Structure formats: structure tokens, C-alpha cells
Symmetry: D2
């Protein structure tokens, strides 16, 4: 037992405040509704990272660009990567016009309510699990800079 709490169903404004509470800086696309997190670019391989809220689910995602020569090998390793974390998911986003991306993300289901403490844990856990995947891909020479 940790006691009684009262749960909140957050909107994006609650999330801005809860991020401000933790001293986590966020920035905000002209082109999207995600809260972008500049500190995540400190991890080798990370080009962008953000918090989205959609259909009752908070998502924390990082994006890295993949070298063309590593794309087939990385696609073959996706099972092992997803199996390697209890909480983080990984997949490729491939377009004809861009460099292929590796998306690495964790969700927190919010529609039933959350405490602030649960959000904080999620931010900490996600950052740690995400950066592990992405740094290991970088160190294996799979990513551009």
C-alpha cells in the first residue's frame, strides 16, 4: 500500500504542467500536437523525441535515422529488440522520399486516470528503456548522426 490517491484524466495541458513539475523542457511543432523533448537529443542516434496524447494513450517516442545498409539487418532484429524490453516497442517507418526511421516508444494508458507519480515513473522508465535501444543501435553502427 502507498495510500489513497485521487486520479486525473490528463489532457495535453495537464501533461505540460506535469512536465514543468519535473523540470523537463518541452517545445511545440507548427505541424503536430506532440510535446517535443529536446533533452533526448543528448543520446547518440536520437534525431527527435516527443510525447503524444491520443485516444486516451500517452506515447513517448524517439526517432533515429537508419543507414540504408543497416535497414535489412535491423528489420531482421526487430523481434529481438522488442523482446529485449518489458515495456518499449520498436519499429521502422520507411518512406520513398526520406531516410528510413527507427521508432522506439513506450505508452501509458491514461483514460482510467493517473497520478503525477505514475507519469514521472513513466518518463523515467521510458527515457531509460528508449535510450538503451537507441544507444545500442548507434554503437552497432546502424544509425546516422
Amino acid at each position: 500500500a502507498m495510500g489513497m490517491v485521487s486520479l486525473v484524466v490528463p489532457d495535453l495541458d495537464v501533461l505540460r504542467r506535469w512536465l514543468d513539475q519535473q523540470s523537463i523542457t518541452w517545445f511545440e511543432c507548427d505541424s503536430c500536437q506532440a510535446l517535443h523533448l529536446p533533452h533526448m537529443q543528448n543520446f547518440d542516434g536520437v534525431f527527435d523525441a516527443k510525447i503524444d496524447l491520443m485516444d486516451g494513450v500517452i506515447l513517448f517516442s524517439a526517432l533515429a535515422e537508419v543507414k540504408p545498409t543497416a535497414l535489412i539487418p535491423l528489420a531482421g532484429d526487430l523481434s529481438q529488440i522488442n523482446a529485449s524490453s518489458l515495456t518499449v516497442k520498436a519499429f521502422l517507418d520507411i518512406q520513398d522520399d526520406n531516410l528510413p526511421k527507427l521508432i522506439v516508444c513506450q505508452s501509458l494508458s491514461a483514460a482510467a486516470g493517473l497520478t503525477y507519480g505514475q507519469f514521472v515513473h513513466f518518463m523515467k522508465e521510458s527515457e531509460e528503456q528508449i535510450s538503451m535501444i537507441v544507444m545500442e543501435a548507434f554503437a552497432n553502427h546502424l544509425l546516422m548522426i
Copy 2:
């Protein structure tokens, strides 16, 4: 305001009680630590489904046996399947002696506490998301029959 609720770091006993409170039936392996969920076998392609507790993370997972002729095509589809759900993950488990398995799972991180209502929602959202993915693979002719 709204009401107050208990925040609990659960052990496997907390979860069995919580499943009981939802009238969800669970069975046990003498060979594993998970709580098996017989009702998930009503979706085609599901050979087993279970709740595990691992380092403070609850995992609800479904397992389906994959057709060897569909193993490579499924492996090539994992990005798109993982991209199809906000919450569920999918991956392959391949051994040298068993048929390959598709694991389809959702997690709920319990180390900072959880409430009963969050678990309930987890059980519902996971059953829905997991069953969609498995039913879809089964309809794509990728799975063997239980």
C-alpha cells in the same frame, strides 16, 4: 473532486484477487509463474494467454503458433503490426525444437503503484488490442490452429 482509491504495488496475489473481482477465470502452470487466461482461447489462433509479473511490470500476453511458410512474411510485417496499435507489441519467438510463436502483448508498469480501476482498464484494453492483432493474422492465413 471525484473519489479516492488505493494505490498498491501489486504482487501476484493482488492480481489473482483483482481478476477474481472481475470474474475473470485464471488457471496455473506447474511449469511457470503466469496466470493463464482460458477465455482468450476463444479467439482463433490463440494457443495460450497469460498475465505475468516481471520486475514490477505486468504483462498480458497472447501466443499463437506460426506456419513455417508464413514465418518470413510475418517477420517482414512486424513494423506495420507494431505501428497498428497505440499500446500492443508483437514479436516472434523462434526455437530449434518448437513451432515458431507470435507473441502479442501489452504492459502495465506497476512499480510506482497501480489502482484496481487501472488494472480493469488494462485487462479490457489489452484483450481488445491483442485479439484484433491475432484475429487479423489468423485471417491473413499466418497461424496454425490450436
Copy 3:
């Protein structure tokens, strides 16, 4: 039996002549020793095709550019493609600096000697098997133009 013949071990000059014999036009890179075959660009998907001679093996290869979005699906289909022809081979050539290529090729072992008629058959058979693979990839929307 088709009678007695006398075999020739060709060099690149024999091959130019044998191509001239069949009225097949060839062109010649500043950057390679292959004999390039412009008529093969008449097949949808083909960016270049050539005859190489190396270490006693004549190779007839065509190259097509693959869309990034089709690269993973095509890599998964390489077994089926190679299984589909008795004589043609297919594989990807992927570089970080370029568009991925699909290489589709047939060899003729020449170190033991050949007749002209065997060369002609090879040119005909290769062109037919190669263009089948490449046109089927094009029609399945796997290639750029």
C-alpha cells in the same frame, strides 16, 4: 547430335564481334570493362544492363532501382524469385549514398570454350528470363522508373 564443332575461349573482343554478329548494339563505360546493352532499357524497370567477362565467366546483368518502401518486401521475396527461374539469379545491392538496386543476372561459363550458337542462346535466354523478373517487379509497383 548437332555435329562436330570447334570451341573458342572468348575474350572481350570475341564478345564484341559475336554481339555485332547478332546486331546487338553495345556501348562502353569510362568507368568499367562491361559491354553495356542499350536495348535492355526498353523493359520497364531497367536502368542499365551489361555483359561482363571475369575470371572465365560471362555475366549478363540488368539493374533496376527499387523504391525504399518496397525494399523489405522485395528482400523477403528473393527466395521465391531465385526459385522461379532455372537460370537467372536475383539480389539486392544497397549503398548508404544511393537508391537500392535489384540485380538480375545469368552467367555463361566460358573457360572451357564456347560456340557462337551457345552465346546466342545465352543472350536470348538471359534477355527473356531477366525481363520477366524485372517486368513482374515493375508491375507489382516495386521499382522506380
Copy 4:
């Protein structure tokens, strides 16, 4: 000048005689049309090897059983393996009831005629190229033992 030689469109009898002339032993399936080559089992990973004649093309092929845990990694290596030889091809044969197989093969197009000497060279070059590929996969731990 150099000498003259017979140009022959072969049938399977022409090939058996030609293998005999090279003292290469061949056996037969009551279940297939190929001439099996017992000496190819001396290379590790080779479960079978054979000469087929199909639409006027001679195929020399070797078969190795693939470890299910290496199936996906091998599939991802096929480009590089096919690019490693000027003449040999490699691909997978996956069924729902057998272990997956790696086929490694070379062809010789016979419809415009072949001479005995071209066949001999074919037999030597194929054995060399095919065995290199198979021995290499076996050393990469991809294959099961015959």
C-alpha cells in the same frame, strides 16, 4: 585451330554416361528424376546433392537443412551470398512439415548443345562454388547436421 568435339543436346542417359566417364558415382531416387551424387555428402551440411535436367537446363544442386533459429538471419544474408559467386545461386525452400532447406545450385543451359568437356568443367566449377557456400554457412552455425 585446336581439335573438334561433339555438340550434343543431352538427355539423362547422356549425362549418366558422362558422369561415368569422369568416374563420378551417382545413385537414384525411386521418388525423383535426379542423379544423386553421394560424394557431395563429404562436405559438412550437405544432406543431398544432385543433377537434374529440366527443360533442357542441367542443374547441379546441394541441399542443407537450416536451423529454425537461423532461418531469418540466412534469409537476410541471401543477397550477399548470391553476390559472392559469379555462378552459384542460393535460396530457401520452406515447407510447413519439413525443416527449411537451403538450396545452393548452378545451372548449365543445354538446349543449344553441350560438349563433354563443358560438362566436366561444369561439374568441377559447381562442386567448388557450391561447397564453398555450404561450408561457409555450416561454419557460420546456420545448418543442422546430416
